[PDB]
């Protein structure tokens, strides 16, 4: 299985397709440039405990996307995805 993420850089709806159907089962991560990673969205729509509530995710059969309303300074970070449907589990390319 391969997952592609359509924007390569961002200068605010970040979408990612999939090779197959994944039936939910997708997480959204973010990486600060210091080197710390924490997740933002789990099971394609829910929010993590301790996130600003401007993030939101869409849902479909195979094409998922992230929605950010307003921007901020330390919001600027590369965003990854993950399918946990079937091993081996694969990330995406990332933006920004």
């Amino acid at each position: 299985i391969q997952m592609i993420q359509s924007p390569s850089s961002m200068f605010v709806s970040l979408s990612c397709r999939a090779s197959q159907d994944i039936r939910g089962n997708l997480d959204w991560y973010q990486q600060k440039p210091g080197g710390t990673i924490k997740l933002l969205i789990y099971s394609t729509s829910n929010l993590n405990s301790g996130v600003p509530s401007r993030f939101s995710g869409s849902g479909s059969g195979s094409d998922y996307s992230l929605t950010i309303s307003s921007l901020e300074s330390e919001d600027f970070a590369d965003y990854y995805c993950l399918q946990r449907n079937a091993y081996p589990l694969t990330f995406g390319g990332g933006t920004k």
Partner: protein, 116 residues
């Protein structure tokens, strides 16, 4: 508080092997799987495999079947990963994450990384 403290960085000449550690403290160690990751500098990440410290069953990615081995210690509460036959393309940062109680792969706790 859940902490995943990895070792400091190290480097090696080609043709050798190396071993690292991801020491965990703040929870019961024998309940959660210990996944390991790989990020080449400037690219995306890649799943290597996990270790089940309750049973010592491991499941590897198909690319990393011959490179890495995965062990887990119960007494010192430390998961290890040993490479083999290092080349020029093994220079990366290696992570360690934690699963969930029910065996799902969504990672909430992470290590800091260790260059090679």
């Amino acid at each position: 508080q859940v902490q995943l403290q990895q070792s400091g960085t190290e480097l090696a000449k080609p043709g050798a092997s190396v071993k690292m550690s991801c020491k965990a403290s703040g929870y019961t160690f024998t309940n959660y799987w210990m996944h390991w990751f790989k990020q080449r500098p400037g690219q995306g990440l890649e799943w290597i495999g996990y270790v089940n410290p309750n049973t010592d069953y491991t499941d590897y990615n198909h690319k990393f079947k011959d490179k890495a081995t995965l062990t887990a210690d119960k007494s010192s509460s430390t998961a290890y990963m040993q490479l083999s036959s290092l080349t020029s393309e093994d220079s990366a940062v290696y992570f360690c994450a934690r699963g969930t109680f029910g065996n799902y792969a969504s990672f909430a706790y992470w290590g800091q990384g260790t260059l090679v």
